[PDB]
Amino acid sequence: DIYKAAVEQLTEEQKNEFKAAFDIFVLGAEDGSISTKELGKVMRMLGQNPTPEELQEMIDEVDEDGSGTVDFDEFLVMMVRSMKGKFKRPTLRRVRISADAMMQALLGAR
């Protein structure tokens, strides 16, 4: 359930971006979920030559409810699992601390 907590942290733009990708995977599917047939076609389009066992094990790992297919909610958990600003937030903090330290040196001067 720990991966489901980070799903709610995703922005509206990230969820819409992932939905667009998911839609390409399920374009050939009648039930709106990714089966080995859809996965195999996508894998072959990307230049891969997967075996049937490879396709089944890929689906099985991200398939939480044993349906043999991947739905959008399971797809989102899979995306969050692979995403496990190092520069931006701490740098903006250090720059603010520096500007504050300069203002403190000024106002605090005798």
Q: CB neighbours (10 Å) of residue 15? A: 15
Residue 4 or residue 96: which is nearer to Ca ion going by CB?
4
Fill in the per-residue mask, 73 to 92: x = in contact with Ca ion (CB under 5 A), - = not in contact. Answer: --------------------
Place of tokens 């909610």: 73
Instruction: Work out the burial of residue 80: count CB atoms within 10 Å of its CB; fewer than 13 is exposed, 13-18 middle, 19 or more buried.
Output: buried
Q: Is 67 a binder of Ca ion (CB under 5 A)?
A: yes
Range in contact with Ca ion (rule: CB under 5 A) among 15-23, 49-57, 65-73, 100-108: 65-73
Q: Residue 13, interface with Ca ion (CB under 5 A)?
A: no
Q: Hey, is 34 helix, strand or coil?
A: strand
Residue 61 assigned to a binding site = no
Amino acid at 40: G
Residues that bind Ca ion (CB under 5 A): 63, 65, 67
